[PDB]
Structures are given as C-alpha cells and as structure tokens.
Amino acid sequence: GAMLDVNFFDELRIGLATAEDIRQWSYGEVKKPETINYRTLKPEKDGLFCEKIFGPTRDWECYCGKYKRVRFKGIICERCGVEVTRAKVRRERMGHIELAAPVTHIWYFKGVPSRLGYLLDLAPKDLEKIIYFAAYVITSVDEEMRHNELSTLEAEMAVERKAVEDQRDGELEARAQKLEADLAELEAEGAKADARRKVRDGGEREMRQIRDRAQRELDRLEDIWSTFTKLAPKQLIVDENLYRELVDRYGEYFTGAMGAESIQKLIENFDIDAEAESLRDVIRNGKGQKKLRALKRLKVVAAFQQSGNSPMGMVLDAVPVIPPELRPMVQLDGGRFATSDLNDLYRRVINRNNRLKRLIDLGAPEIIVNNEKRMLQESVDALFDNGRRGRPVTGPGNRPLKSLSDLLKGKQGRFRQNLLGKRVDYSGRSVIVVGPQLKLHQCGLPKLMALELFKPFVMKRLVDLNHAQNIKSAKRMVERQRPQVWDVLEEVIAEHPVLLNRAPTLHRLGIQAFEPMLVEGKAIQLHPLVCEAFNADFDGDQMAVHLPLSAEAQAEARILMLSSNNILSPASGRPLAMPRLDMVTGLYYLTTEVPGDTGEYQPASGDHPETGVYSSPAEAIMAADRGVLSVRAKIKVRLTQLRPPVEIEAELFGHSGWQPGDAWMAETTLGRVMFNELLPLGYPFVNKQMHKKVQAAIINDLAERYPMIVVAQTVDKLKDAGFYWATRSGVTVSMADVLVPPRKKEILDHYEERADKVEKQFQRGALNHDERNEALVEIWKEATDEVGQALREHYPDDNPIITIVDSGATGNFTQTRTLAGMKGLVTNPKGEFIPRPVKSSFREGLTVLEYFINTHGARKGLADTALRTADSGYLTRRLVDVSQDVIVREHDCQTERGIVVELAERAPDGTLIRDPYIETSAYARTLGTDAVDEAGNVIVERGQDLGDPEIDALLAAGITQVKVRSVLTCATSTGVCATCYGRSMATGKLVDIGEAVGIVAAQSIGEPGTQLTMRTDITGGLPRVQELFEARVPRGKAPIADVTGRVRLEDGERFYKITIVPDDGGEEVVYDKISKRQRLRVFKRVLSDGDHVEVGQQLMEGSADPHEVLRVQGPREVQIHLVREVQEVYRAQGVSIHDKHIEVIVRQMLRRVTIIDSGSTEFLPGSLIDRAEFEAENRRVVAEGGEPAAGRPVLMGITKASLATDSWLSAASFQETTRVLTDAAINCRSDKLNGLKENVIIGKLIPAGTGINRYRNIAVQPTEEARAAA
Template sequence: SDLNDLYRRVINRNNRLKRLVDLGAPEIIVNNEKRMLQEAVDALFDNGRRGRPVTGPGNRPLKSLSDMLKGKQGRFRQNLLGKRVDYSGRSVIVVGPQLKLHQCGLPKQMALELFKPFVMKRLVDLNHAQNIKSAKRMVERSRSVVWDVLEEVIAEHPVLLNRAPTLHRLGIQAFEPQLIEGKAIQIHPLVCTAFNADFDGDQMAVHVPLSAEAQAEARILMLSSNNILSPASGRPLTAPTQDMVLGLYFLTSLREKQLGEGRSFTSIAEGLMAYEQNSLSLQAKIKIRVNINGELVTKETTLGRAIFNEVLPESFPYVDYDVTKKALGLIVDNLAEGYPKVVVAQVLDALKELGFIWATRAGATIGIVDVVTPGRKLEILEGYETKADKVQSQYEKGLITDDERRQELIEIWTQATNEVAKEMEDNFPRTNPVWMMVFSGARGNMMQIRQIAGMRGLVANPKGEIIPRPIKSNFREGLSVLEYFISTHGARKGLADTALRTADAGYLTRRLCDVAQDVIIREEDCGTDRGLTLKIGNIVAGKLTRDDYVETSIYGRTLAEDVVVDGKTIITSGADLGDRLINDLIDSGVAEIKVRSILTCDSKVGQCAKCYGRSMASGKLVDVGEAVGIIAAQSIGEPGTQLTMRTFHTGGAATASGDITHGLPRVVELFEARTPKGVAPIAETAGVVSFLEDAKGKKIIVTPEDGSEAVAYPITRRQKLLVEDGQKVSVGQQMVVGAIDPKQVLKILGARSTQTHLVHEIQEVYRSQGVGIHDKHIE
C-alpha cells in the first residue's frame, strides 16, 4: 500500500545514511542524504506539504498519514462521525396525497427487511415457527402469514426519514409507516418544504429506531406533526404550497357578475347542489348561512369561502378574503399559536385535501396564448431609444465620460424595463391562469413573467458588469442571435455559482456549529436587568404602525423591564412577547421596549432561558439543556445555500465601489469580522465635514467643534458620499456608501454597538433574498 511505499523510502535512506556515516563519506554527500531522509519522513507524515508530492505509479500522489485523517473521506468524517447503520434503507420518493401529516408510505419489501428481527421474534411468539432459524426462513420465502405479522409489528412503531443534505434539524423527521405496494417511499406533500424535497427523482433514507426509548423519543420529539414551526424564524414550514395554494386561491377568490350572484342559501350543502347543477358559480357573491363561533349566521360571502371556512376550527375568525400563499401562512401561524397540535395537524390535512380537490376542479391550464405581450411595448421602447441615442451622442461629442454614459444608459433601460413590466401587469386580466399562479404565490414570480411577456432587460457580462444594451425581446417572441449570445453569460454563471455555493454553505454551517456548540441553555433565569432597546413601531402618517422587522427582532423574546404608560404598568417584565402582546403595545402607543437578549445574559456558563426567550420551534419558553447554539448555526447555514453569490440583476445599481458584496461571502465576512474590501470610513469624532481634493484623490476632513485636531479620511473618487460639505456628523456616522469595518465600530462605539451592527448587517443580506431568520440566532 501507499504507506508501505513511504515507510520503505524512509528505511532505505536511513540505512544508506548509516552506511555512509560509518564509511566516513565526505560531508557534502552525508548532508544530501540527511536532506533526503528528512524529505522522506515529511512525505510519510504529510505528502505534498513541502515541495513536490511523492508519486506512485501513474503519477498519483501517495496517500500519507495525514491524508488518511483529513477531508470528507478521511478517518474522522467517514468512519468516526458518520457510520453506516443497520436497519436502514433508501428509495426514491413519490407524493402520497392520501396520507395524514404524521404518516409515510413504506414499500412492503423494504418494511419486511427493515423490521426483520421484530417479525421473526413475533413469529416465534405466535408459534408460527418453532425457532428463530425457521422464522428466518419463513421471512425469506415471504409466506402469507408473514405479512399479517408485519402489519402488527409496524403499528405504532415510528420510522425516521432523512433527505441528504440535512441542513437543519428538520431534515430528519419521524413518521408512522403505512405499508404500500410498489417500491417507492410515499411522503406527505406538506413536509416537502422542511426536507427541501421534490419528486423529480429525489431519494430518501429510512432508519428504524430500535429500543423503546428511541421509539418514544422519535414519537415525542421528531414526529412531523410536532414540528410544524421552523426553528429559524418561528413561522410555519408546513403550509400548503404550489397546487394546493392555487386550488385554495381559486376556491376563495371573489368575482363580479358571476352566475347566480345575489341568491340566498340556507346551508352549504344547498349551495353545493346548485353548484353541481351549474346554476351557481363558486366565486359569485351570495348570502349563505354559516356557522361562526357555534351559531348560524347569514353572511354575504361566496360559496367557495364558505367551504373553505368549514375546515377551520369553529372558533377561528371567518376568512372573507382571497387566500394567497401569504394569507395561508398567517392562518397556519395563528392556528399554531392558538390551538393544540392535534387540531393544527387535522386542519392542515383538511386544507391539503381541499387544495388538491379544487385545483383539479379549477382545471387551470396554461397555453401560449395566455402569455400576453403588451401592445404598447414598441412605442414605449421607441421613446427610450431616442433618450439612449441622445446620451450616446453626448458621449461622442465628449460632453460626458464613458462611466457616466454607462451609468445613464443603464438607468434609462432599467426604467424602460420597469415601464414595460408595469404595462404588462396592467394588461393581464385577473382571471388569466398565469397571473393567478403568480398572484396566489403558487409558483413563479413577476420577474419570470416579465422575461416571458415583457422584455428581458439588462444582463451582465462574465465580469459581472452590466452590459448597457438591453435585450428587448422576451421569451414569447424569441431572442435574436445576438441577444441569445449575450444572455448565455448570465445563465452559465448561474449554474457555476450554484455548484460552488452549496459547498461553501455547508462549510459555513460546520464552522458555525464548531463555534456555537457549547452555547447551551443552562439555567432558567440569570437575573440580569440588562437588555437591548429595540423599536417595535414606526410613526407613519401620524399613526404608530408595527415595524416591518418585528417578526425577526422582537417576536418571541422576554421583556426586560416593565412597560409604563401614563404612570401605570401595562406589561410587567418577564412577559413573553407574542403577536398579541406586540399589537397591544402598539395600540397603547409604545414605540420602543427593552428586551432580554443573549448578548446581555449574565449566566456564568452557557445562557439562561429568559434571555433566549421562546424556542422558535415549539412556541414556548426554551427548555433548560436545549442546544441553542447548534440550532442557531443550522438556522443561519440552511438558507445559506439559497443566498446567491451575487444578486444577479441589480436594477442598474452598479454603485461606486462595485456592489456591496452580497450573499454568502458577505455573511462569512461578517461572522469573521474581517475588514471588508472598499471600506467605508466612519467618523471617530463629532464635527463638521469639509472636502479636500488634491492630485492623490479626495479626502473627507472632519473638524471637531471643540477645536481639537481635524481628522482626514482618504476616499476614492468614485465612492458615493453620504455627507455634504458643512454638514455636522456624530460619532460613528458612516460617511460614504459601502461596508463598514466592524473593528472600527468596536474601537469607536464600543462592543454593544458592534454586536447590533453585525446582527443588522447579516439580516440585510438574508432579507434581500427574502429569508426570515430570528435575530437571536445570529446573536
């Protein structure tokens, strides 16, 4: 083997050296031999660390001792941290729409093999077989009695399903197996989001928990119906998606002038009869008697909405609006906050059934005629074409620089794209299936429709710069050869990025886990009175409204001090801030509150439950012993895969020092508190700003008001300024567009501000991709 070769080299050289020394060879030869011995030893320990690696036959570098330990294939990750286990199997997954939320379909042959020892024991117990050996033979020949026994064994025995890359703890969940024919595992459509699974040939692995303890643990902690909320944001992950959303949207939408508008019905059943006889439309406004809070009330609504409300719990407020994906999320959210898990699971299953049924009945189809290009497109473009020509001629006359020309052209064409897009959106009839899919949130977004029906707009070249000539066609009309060629850059970059990104995100998660693994909840309450003051509302048009980021900043934390309004305490400290409390606070006009935070926790070891607040996954105060560090690391790493390297179509916002780096690299940079490229200076002292330009470049000069020495900050000519001449700045104010160096914030403003700054910046990156994570994880 390789090691033997490397050892052999060491021995040979060592013996030769011994012989040379004994013979008293000249020093030059001995030294050469010593060097060769040293190299042989180095190669044995770590081949290729210094100089050229020692190669075996076929120029393959030999595998040294340290190569055996490191990397994914090394001893540690291959055999010690991950082993192959018995009682496990894998197969392709297919959808099982008839399953309940806590069930999965397990192929019979697979189940028999997985539960073999249980089946054999049961066969002996029931005297179908004399000894284990004959029982084994029965199982292998799969006699008819074996299947009955298997049914019995499998009942109440959960199995674990896992889809590889397990990015967060919801990548492994427990289900009760139902035996099915065929060879594919069936999986409930609502848990796909958590596993990030789809049915284009994904495979999943099954594991069987053996001991009674393992079974109980799987049932209590890992059953899918107990894991409805995401540990990252506390929002439901198990909300209906795709077809179900489309069906429910179709069911609950309201249209004017429909068949049977204005009629009255005594019950939903009567309404359904009229619908079956084609004398009433689902979306027509009618009066119908519905059950609200246990009493029958006549309500003006549509038949579809009445049907939809049938599946919700009686005490749930009547839903009288178009149900889109967002609305569904909120409904599931309120269910999870106010009802027991059993009820939530039942309602979710009912919504799933309803969604599939009505998506089928709706018969939404898309034909090429459904993609309508706006008629005014040509005339809009001609208007912008003249503007662009004007800029071009200004450039040719030498009135503007090349940079300015590019900037202006990019702005002109971005505007054009947006105008065409707006025209297109106004152009779509509300009953158009494409529009329904996008608007309900079932699939697709406006950007995609824009490229199919509007115009593709500006694209970037391989260097990531935006090409100042737009693609005027859309996919419906077809692209010209040149346009097609230009757009291949972007497409290819997208694919290459995806491949690289996944590995990076996985590595980030591993590093975060490594750092945070000892952050564990160790006690109930550390008794600190410190906390962070965060705002919960903004004054908009004279009225206090809820801040957009409450969801991720305040929700689920603990209050650090009493909230006092007009001398009386409305909420005492230590309260758990849920949605209702936050709304109460805003109604009573409170804009800022002080909350407990991990950053200010006083526990000696680990953290205390009160400072952490509620566990996002269960909606209750976190338990002592919960490994919150790991959960946080997973919550941050899991969406990492979705963060694109660089948001690709920046709407013409090629700002001064290039774009602020987006996506993963930026997150990594923040976690490691590195100094970012193109650093933006922040003021060390308060004072008045003035500018100085000389041959070397621009400087910003801040003159303090107390007359001490002025401070100069060099900047490049292209950086966009955030301050003007003669403006007063405060300590720590950012003066140009760009990323701030966390180390400077630390030096000037202190540790607490740095922490809040980093949390805020990381959130910016994730929000730009529409990912919600709770601040507490980042802290």
C-alpha cells in the same frame, strides 16, 4: 489511566512521548524489512508482520501449531515465542525501531513557527543546515582554558605569521637576484628597449602575484584567529575547511557536531528557567522588534517550563511502529495482494537504519556515514509527514505515498471521514413520489425495502408464530420471500417509526419521523406538505430511510421528531406545513367572489322577493348540485354551526355565547362556507379570499391558540379541499392564454427613436463611449417597465397566468413579462448590461443573436448557483463550530441587564407608525423592565413574553421603547438561561432546559444561502455575510469619526483628506489616504466642509469596519452594528430570521479580552483570554495586593474563536489538525470532554437534549393506587 477503555473517561490528555514511553508501549523490536513469505504467505520472524511481536494470526494458536486451544490461554510457546491468545490483538500491539543515530521530529522543526528554532534561538535556515548535515554548530566552548591560554596562542600565531613573512622576504631576495641577472643580461645586449622591460614587467607581475599569495594566506590566518577568539555556542561554521583548521590548531577548548545529535546536545545544555527569566526581562524593559520577538519566543519557552515536559522529546531515539492490522496486507480474489503504503515507509526506515549500523561497525569514512545519517533522517521525515520538506516520495505511477499525517488531515482524514460521520446499518434509500392520500404523520414504504430493514423482527415473529422451526429456516423463508412473510411484516411494522432524510440536511426539519405503511412498487410516498421542509420535488429526488432500534430511540422519533409535531419553522416561526401551489390555487378559486355569477343574491322587489337566500348550506349544496348556484356567487345563508365574527357576535348574541346551534344570517359565498367548515369549531368565520398570506396568518393564529393535534388535522383538511378545487378550477396554459400587449410596437418605436438619438450624438462626438452606454441602459430600463405596465393592464383578472401569480401560489411578474412582453436587458460574462436589449418575448420566439446573447447570463447563473451551495455549506460548518457550546442550562440568571429595542418610532404629525421589522426584533422576547406611560401605571410587567396583545397594548399606551432580555447580556457562566433566550420559535413557548440553541442558530443563519445574490466595490451577498462573521476589515472601508467636532473636508490632488477639530480643544484627528472612488456620506444631503459630526459618524460611504466601532464606541455599539448589517443582507432577499439567532453568534465573538499589561499574574501581553477568567484572576490579585492585569475587548472571527477553544479534540477536528496537535502536545493539554463534538467522537451521550442529568436520571414507578388495584 484506563487502557482497556470501559466507558468511564474523565479526561483525554495529550503530550509528547519520550523514548522511554515508546519502548514501554512496544511489545518488541522490529528489525527486518520483511513482511510475509513469498511461498507460504505466512509472516516472517522479526519482520513488520511478526507474530512474536504483534500477536498470533489465528485465534488461540501459536506459530508452530504446538498449542492450539483455550486450555492453553496466555502461555508463550517455548519454540516460536508466540503468545497463544486472540487474533484481534494485532490491532493493539505496537513495536519499535531502535535508531542507530538520533533523528528530529519533523513537526517541531519545520512547520511555521519553528518550535525548535524558537526554543533554541536559531533561525530555521540555520537549523536546516545543521540537522541535514550541511554545517557545523558549536555545542560547547571552554572559557577558563581559553582565557588562560589566549596569550600563548597569540604568541604562537604571531610566530607563524613571522615565518610566513620571512618566507616572502626570502622570495623577495631570490627574485631580486633573478631581476638583477635580467638587468645584466638585457641592458648589455642589443634588443628592443621595450622588450627589455617586458621581462622585468613579468618579473614585477611575479612579485605582485607572489605577495598576493602571501597576503591571502595571511588573511586566512587572521580569519582563523578571529574565528577562534569569537567562539561561542550555537554558532554555525560553514566552510568545512575553516572548521578543519579550527579543530587542527585548537582542538581543545570547544566541541562541535552536525545533525540531530548536536541538536540534542544543545537541548541538554539548555537552561529553561534562566532563558525564561531573561525573556521576561526583555518583555518588561525593551521595546520594538526585540520585544515582539521575545513575546513569540516566550510562548514556547513558557510552555516547556510551566508543564512537566522536557524539550528532549523533540529528538527521536526510537520510532514506534503501528499495529499490523491498521496497515494490512490483504489477499484479493485471484491471489493478488494489496498493501497499505505505510509498509513502504517503515521499510525505508528499517533498510537505512540497518545499513547505517553496518557502516558504523565497518569503520567507513565520514562522507559515507554522514550521507547515510542524512538519508535516515529524511526517511523518518517522509514517514511522519510526506512532502512537507522537499519532494514527496512516490510509488508507482508518480503517486505520492500516504504518510501518518495524511491519515488525520483533511476532508478525507480520520476526524472528518470516520469519526464525525459514518455509514450505518438498518438503512435504505429509494426515490420519492407524491402521496396525497396520506396523513401528515405517515409515509409509504415499499414492501421490498421494509422486508430488508425489519429482517430480525420478522425472523423472530416467524419463529414465534410457528411458521418456522428455528432462526435458520426463518432466515431462509425471508430470503426466499414466502407468502407468510408479508402477513408477518404488517404486524411487525405496525407503529414503529422510521426517520426519512433528504440530503443536504440544511436545517433540522430535513430529518423527520413518519409512521410507515407498506406500499407496492418501489418508490417512497412522501406527504405533499413536507416538501418545503425537506426541499424536495419529484423530478428524480431520493430519500434515505433509517430505523430506530431501542426504546429511547423510538421514543425520540415518536415524540421529538414526528412530522406533525414540527409545523413551524424554527428560524422565524412561520408555518412550513402549509398549503402551497395547487392547494393555494384551489382555495383561492374556492373563496374568490365573482359578481354577476349564477344564482346570485338579488335584492329585488316590486314583483317578487329576494331569491338569493338559503336556509342552510345543505340547501345551498343541493342548489349547486343542480345548475342553479355557483360556488363563487354571493348569497345569504343561514348558519347555525359556524361561529360569527367578533362584530356580528357582539351585536347579535349577548354577554358571551354564540353557543353552537344558535342561528345567524351570513352574507357570503357558498365556497367560503365550505372553506370555513374545515377550520375548528370555535374559530370565527373568516369571509375573506384566500391569498397565501391570508392562509399563513390563519395557520399562525391556529398554532398560537389551539393544540398541535388540531393544527395538524386542519392542515390535512385544507390539503384535501385545495387539491379537489384545484382540479375543478380551469387553470391551463395554451398559446391563446399568453396574450401579447397591443401597444408593444408603439412603445418600442418610441424608445428606439431615443436610442437612435443617443447613438447619433455619439457618432457626432459629443459624448464618450461609457456615457453612451449609460444613456442606452437607462432608456431600455424605462422601456421594459412601460411594456410590463401595458401588459399588466391588458391581461384580465381571471387569466390562468395572472391567477397563478396573483394567488401567491408560485411565480412572480417578471417571469410573466419575459414570457409575454419583452425579455429586456441581459448581462455580459462579466456582469454588466449589454446596451442592445432582447425585444422579443419567448412567446414570439427569440432570434438567433438574441438567443446567443441570452445564453451568457443563463450559464453564469447556473455556475454561481453551484458555487453558492458550496460556500453556504462552509459558512454553516464554521458557525456550528463557533457556537456549539451555547445550550440552555438554567431557567433564570435573574440579571437586570438587557437591550433596548426600537418599536415604532414617532411621526412628526403625531401618530405611531409601527416599525417594519418588529416581528424579528421585539416579538418572542422577555421584558426586562416594567413598561410605564408618563411614569404612570405599568402596562406590560417584567417577565412577559411580548406577543401580539402585548405589542398592541404598548403601542396603544404610546410607548416607543422597551428593554428586553437578550443572550448578549446573560449572566450565566456556562451556556445561557431560558428567560434570556425567550420563546422557542418552533414551539411558541419558552425554551427548554437542554436545548442546543447554538446549533439551531447556525442552521437558521446558514440555510438561507443559495438565494443570496450580490445584485442585479462593496460586497453584498453571501460574501458580505462571510466577512461580517469573520470580522475582517471590509473591501470598501469607510472611516468613522473618533470624537465630536467640526470637519475639514480638504480636497487634495484628485481625492479627499478629512480632518476633525474636536470641541474639547484636543488635537485634530486626520484621515489621510482616502481615494475619490468612494463618495462622501449623505444624511438627511452630502457632508460638506465646516460641519459638525458625532463620535460614531461614518465619514465616507462604504462599510465601516467592526474593529473600530468597538474601539471608539463600545461593546454595545458593535453588537448593534453587527446584527443590523447581517440582517440587511437577508432582508433584501425577503428572508426572515429572528434577531436572537444572530445574537447567539455575535455573543461568541465578544467572549474575550486582550491583555495590555501583565500586571502580576501569568498573562503575557497581547494574548487573548476569556473574560470570565480574566476576572477570576483579578479578584485573586486585588486580594493579596493591588496589582491587577489590564484588558481591552476584542472582536474575533468565527474561525479564530473556534480554534482558540479549550478542547483540543474538537479543535483538531475543525481544521489545521497538524498545527493544533503539535502545540497541544507542547502545552501538555487535557480535554475534559465537556463539548457536543467530543462526546460524538468518543461515543457517549451529548450534553444536550435528553442526555443531561436532569432528564437522563428520571425514576419511573407505578403510583400506589394503580399498583395495588391491578
């Protein structure tokens, strides 16, 4: 189709190029291994850099300089032949090498499975011998001539064997004559009676060896005859001498050859339709290894049949040559040259081809000619794929050369290094510092970085303000940094957002857009509220700055990704731009209430009134400016501009209407009034002490009930007040604040006696080595807990260490225990505890041996942190690749399917204990059925969002279960709809109709890596998540039951064996080889013999595998199993993901069915096909007959499901590039460029977000009233 590539592509098709294609792309044959002249450094004619083939080196000149302008454009010089045109055509013109002997392509011969071997039915070992000139193959045989001359040739062979045996008879006569002469000359003369038998024994040895020579020659003749009688095509003949005897005696009737020319004659005499028919008869009738082999063969035979490909394109008659400026020869500074490793591979091909032409026209013997052909074949193989077959060709320094397949594969190949991610202009980087004076939408950009990023804008403005005459002098003014430049740079930087990025970008809030303002100095100033999103501290981190240029890109940065528009985390909806660490210490100090503090409320009477009561917070602030009041003393204020809480408002004011200005009397502290003046005006008065959980609940309520601008302004006010009262708060560390518990010696002596008792019991021999370690580990765990409890009781409530932990600001109490207290048990380099603990705190100072023991665990923790970061990155890459085609396409598929969610199971005493994970299961979901009570009135009707008021109404009406819409059961053909997905967690409303919900799901799952540890043979951390998503059979696999019945817990030789006798009277189910390392399953008590089990009951203890839950129980029960088992890994570390981010991934594993019967339509059994087209090829077949295919569900991994995709261009860039490209070409696949990744590679708008036709084709015009009235 298109060849100039003007961007209207519909498809990209890959196939297998034949020799006519190659020598039709070519602009000329290269026939010399020359590159440039060594003296004049200009290209050589017919060489690898030739201008007559590849186009001229200088713009609009020929080679001899005869034609030198655009006036002569498009003509060819009659002397040198160079077409005078642009010099950039040397990146576009290909040439070719015309081979003197055919060569196989290495991709279709070598890599498992051998596609040439499957097509021709030759083993790879028997194919390597042919194409590398080590054996012969019979290309053809003649059956009519053989069948009509078999009798005469048999007569000839019998005649020759008769002659051989008559020769042996003549030898028998001659040696009998010599033997009788020996008899007459030994028996009639006096010698030893044994020595007269030694000569006759030598004669008998001569007879034995001569008849052995005759027997071996007769056996060789029989071998030649049997080989000719059993001659068929595709039959290897090793033993060159046997082949030579065959061509000598029976040189007609057959043909044979070695190498790729014989392979191409076998492909010429190949009947694709007949071979496919016989393979289909085998897969219908036969069974076993024959049927499995025939299925694997029929994949490639049917691929060559059903397309328009011919299999002759797997043998090469011409080799294409890549254009010269994609393998350049550059001249460095200092006259040194650097070249590109493909010129050496191409030069080897040309050198061996030219020498082969010389030998063939010289008439050399076949030893020399075959050695040259084998060398030519190996050089073309090393060009295409170096080191695939044999040792790689190396350059100087034993460095292997970089071939054509190395340009594509790997992390450093084309697809991943240059196409999916690039280096960009208008782009800077510096090191971030804290900017606590900024607002949330602002960043500080150093002026020397901004002057370089905004350079064309300021050059334009300098010319416009007549500071410069033209663009040349304006560029000089910017380069020399004149004083007018800064006055202009403020103007051009005003209201133009920049994107700030901190690597690694783990989720989407790692790129945010800020409105820059110029700072002096050389560091970026980041707002202190976006550090949790970016995961940035200020110990040396660096950020990248990018500049959006067009109107659409500026509008996206200003609307979609401004920093104050993204407060909530898109994974759970919890607020991320929230106060933390110092802003939590300050607000906790401000809002705590201290009894007995200065100027408190006294209720006093008898002599004087109350004296704690204030008429306004202005009067309270004046009294606290004097030394008369504390900010944390309990007073009674009179508030008029703060809304009372719900109970006080209901009691005091009427049907509604606090109505600002109406006075009420509060009983609180002044710091709580000062906190509540930072909240919105209609927000009710809180009167609590501000733990970080309390602040997060307040910010969640504000984000639900108020606009986004109100939420952003409020968190900036909280930032300011928190920092002020943090520095006025009195949190320091000295060594007198690290108190030590006064009972630590008594506790440790009391447990030292118990450890000494266990050690003396080991010394007496009562218990072994390992049980002694177990006793010691339990003793010292109890001692660590008792020391921590005594410490926690000793410390006062206003200690700085306790306050920083207890306010939720940072830290936890085990760090406080190791700092003051006792470090406890430490691990080994393996991971087991060491039975001597660390009994010193870090306040006391560890000893030499305790410090050396503690370093083992410290270093293992650091190394595991590095490895965990790499593994979490790999998992996120696989999850993105599997679920990139789940985007919201619709508003409502109107299905009536849904899932049932659990929602507060019912206590036996009678009440509704709320489910602990109900914020990640039942919130943010659309109801699917009307929720009724006792079939009465509906409470929450169908289509509702299920927030906090709805969940409270359901639990008050006493409903334990609801049916919600899910993406597991969506009816939309492509993508999902917005009602089934539900609320977007980051915006709090229903999801939009272009959202890339699968990218959001993959980053929401994969960002909480690096905090998923195994424990303190069942996998339990990030290796557990990577084997649920990859659908492997687990490490500690526990069996599950198959049918209801009673059990047979047979205890065999030292381990178990379990048999289930079904209640239906069916046959028993036997679980045979069960080791006794795994214990039996406990439920409510351990499984005993003679017990009744259910159909999905897990028998042993361990991990059930997901493939058997799908077979036994169904597709719904593997979705319950896989979602719950992933969340158990995350919930153990206190990480919140909504369930809808795991059901986006799990839905993509169950997209397919496996074929168990072909039916009548093109579906090979055992192949996995999509369920939507399994049923679109069954309604076509239950019409015009009754013969459907039969399919069974499969569960796939995220690697296996994302390589079996319809786009070859997004599967080749995922992984296994060479294997994907070598059967996309055989199947002649076509790529409709529908995906999110294929639009990134080729450079057009992704089909999500603002790049969809609903939004991209908006037509904007002034309205009629505003047009005519201006």
